[PDB]
A paper describes a structure:
Non-homologous end joining (NHEJ) is a major pathway for detection and repair of DSBs in mammalian cells. Here we perform systematic interactome analyses of human NHEJ factors and identify a novel XRCC4-like protein named paralogue of XRCC4 and XLF (PAXX). The crystal structure study reveals that PAXX forms a homodimer through its N-terminal domain that is structurally similar to XRCC4 and XLF.
Immunoblotting of the Ku80-associated complex further validated this finding. Based on the sequence and structural similarity to XRCC4 and XLF (see below), we renamed C9orf142 as PAXX. The space groups for both data sets were P6522, with two molecules in each asymmetric unit. As predicted, the N-terminal domain of PAXX was highly similar to those of XLF and XRCC4. Compared with XLF, PAXX showed more structural similarities to XRCC4. In XRCC4 and PAXX, the angle between the head domain and H3 is only ~45° due to a lack of tension. Structurally, the N-terminal domain of PAXX is more similar to that of XRCC4, as both exhibit a 45° angle between the head domain and the helix stalk. The extended stalk of XRCC4 is required for Lig4 binding, implicating that the N-terminal domain of PAXX may lack the ability to bind Lig4.
Numbering used by the authors:
A (entry chain B): 5 to 28, 33 to 69, 71 to 91, 94 to 141
B (entry chain A): 5 to 13, 15 to 27, 36 to 69, 71 to 142
The structure:
């Protein structure tokens, strides 16, 4: 269950999805945001992630649990200009710079994201019969 | 002209963000309750540490994000956060709720001050 959430909150139609990967054969960590046209990412490097785990609480030894938190808790603000993402679930507030992922990389990610979500919905409702 | 802005960005305004002055704080209010950074010299220095170049102003960068409609805000539970999305990196500020007795004179002064500023601005725009 990789965490995610949509925006805006509540009734209205969803305009953005925020999600992340991956801490686990483990990948480095990133947040993603898409309007299902374009895709923005933290595009972290080891140093830049470390320097953000600097500016706030954590040791370099996961952020997933805290993003999972703000998702579960609908606690995510977002702002784009020619982007930034804020997690307000937890004790301190975290701010993330996000930049555009180039098309050739973004397209396959979006495609895979769509198919994956479809599989997850099927599987979730099967596990709702329980 | 101490910078400020209101959100949400033509719908009716529901919050005002502002700051003073340079000890420095950011403030946010719905004109009923008031949230603040509640800085001390050390805590502000330490935030100008955690990011931010030299500990030697933030006003210009808050002024920036105001002018540029670039301010996100989240409230809950006598806790809030304010995010400036102007510059090299996005800045986040934890704000806590100011108790009523401490907030009232600040809200009172804010209101009167804004009134005086509107009068004197239109005087200086009656110019052109």
């Amino acid at each position: 269950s990789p965490p995610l959430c949509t925006l805006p909150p509540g009734p209205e139609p969803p305009r953005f999805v925020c999600y992340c990967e991956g801490e686990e054969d483990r990948g480095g960590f990133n947040l993603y945001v898409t309007d299902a046209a374009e895709l923005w990412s933290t595009c972290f490097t080891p140093d830049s992630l470390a320097a953000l785990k600097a500016r706030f609480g954590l040791s370099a030894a996961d952020i997933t649990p805290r993003f999972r938190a703000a998702c579960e808790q609908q606690a995510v603000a977002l702002t784009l200009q020619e982007a930034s993402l804020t997690l307000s679930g937890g004790p301190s507030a975290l701010a993330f710079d996000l930049s555009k992922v180039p098309g050739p990389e973004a397209a396959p990610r979006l495609r895979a994201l769509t198919l994956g979500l479809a599989k997850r919905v099927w599987s979730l409702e099967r596990r709702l019969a329980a």
